[PDB]
Design a protein around this ligand. Sequence first.
Ligand code: GDP
Ligand code: K
Ligand code: K
Ligand code: K
Ligand code: K
Ligand code: K
Ligand code: MG
Lengths: 296, 170
Amino acid sequence: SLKPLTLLMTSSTSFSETINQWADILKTTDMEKFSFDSNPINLLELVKQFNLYVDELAITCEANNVWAKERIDSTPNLFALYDNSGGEAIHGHAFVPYYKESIVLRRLFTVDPNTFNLSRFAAFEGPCQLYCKEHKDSAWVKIQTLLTLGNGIINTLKIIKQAQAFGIDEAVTENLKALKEQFIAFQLAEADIKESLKAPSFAEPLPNKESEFFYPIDEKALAKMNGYQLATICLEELNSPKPSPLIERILSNKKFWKRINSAFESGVFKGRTDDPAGKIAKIREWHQLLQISGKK
Amino acid sequence: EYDYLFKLLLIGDSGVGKSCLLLRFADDTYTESYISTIGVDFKIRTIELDGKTIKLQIWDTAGQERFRTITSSYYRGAHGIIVVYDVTDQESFNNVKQWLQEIDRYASENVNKLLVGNKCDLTTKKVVDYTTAKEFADSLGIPFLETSAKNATNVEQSFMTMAAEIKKRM
Ligand SMILES: Nc1nc2c(ncn2[C@@H]2O[C@H](COP(=O)(O)OP(=O)(O)O)[C@@H](O)[C@H]2O)c(=O)[nH]1
Ligand SMILES: [K+]
Ligand SMILES: [K+]
Ligand SMILES: [K+]
Ligand SMILES: [K+]
Ligand SMILES: [K+]
Ligand SMILES: [Mg+2]
């Protein structure tokens, strides 16, 4: 009878070292002499810890102003040039060129702890994979590599737990091989990023009093935005706690409302995991409020 | 306690319907809600044919480019791959080309293919004519079905067909 093996987790230790620990265990153990038990493995906590890492990473990119390092335009964000959506909604999101990259980052990578999957941020998925093609070596590529590995690890383990549950051994055995490889791969990628994160020499651009999510959007630019687009923006701003100056602008302006609303009624937002129904209602409220106030 | 075990694989662009297909077919349900599959997942339904009972180990894959490392692992093991495109999505069809290439690059020598045009119920928003698709399909002797995972339209028939097509080759 061969020793039982599992990959446990200390209560507060971070994703990075957690991986690193498992990385040792997996490297230094002749996996032939053990029988792997995935039951004690705490996906939920790992997911929690990972999303927490995604967040921290996102924060430093913004803070170190990594994105400015990474420009050649003044096009509203790194990916703007790569949108061919025609401001359509794509699985609940329209493309809005003003999104901060660090928001884009979080949304392509954080893991829905509920599903161990991704909540669609679709409008940027094409533009992003495009930018990647035309900018190997770019921080976004290096970062996304790293984060995808993150994602991978989680998925692998889920697949192991699941396969064990159904006795599918071919899978469980092979997936352990892979997991180890993802493990190292992750550790490399983690090292490799450290350069790409270095704060450029040009000074920190001055904070945006108006939104947590979008770069500034002047009234000219905002006006060219469509129903789905403004709609998309409203839903995003509701991820702040206090109402934003930006959403107030949008909701106060009488011209923007018809298209915002029809966007809503169109139903493209129905399937969002971010309580669309609730958000929509609240947006309607705030709009109703505002039109009362602007009746002077 | 089963007669056969076929390993199946759905590939295709992101959001073309792979997972709703797998879901309607396995659990006979559908959720409107927007989730993108990470890496892979697998569901297992047992089918009966001729009238041997066949266990289907169906593996769902992520469409995105960045998952390819992973998805590509599960290619060699598959008895049959279903490539899926979304009939209202032009590029998704244009992409079948690469998807077929990825099959050549990764899966077995003799893997059983199947082209599926999903979201067929969206009549007004459609853009890929059954004909044009079916011709391309026939160009390569790969069976082809339009389907709506939402409506159930042909989802059952699709996996049946893929399964039968496999037994024939065993
Ligand atoms: N009308 C219609 N919409 C669909 C159908 N299948 C998928 N969709 C929509 O497209 C989304 C993406 O499907 P999903 O299974 O996530 O695609 P995957 O990324 O290929 O697995 C779904 O959540 C639905 O909103 C279908 O058969 N008919
Ligand atoms: K557990
Ligand atoms: K960091
Ligand atoms: K709020
Ligand atoms: K927040
Ligand atoms: K729909
Ligand atoms: Mg999917």
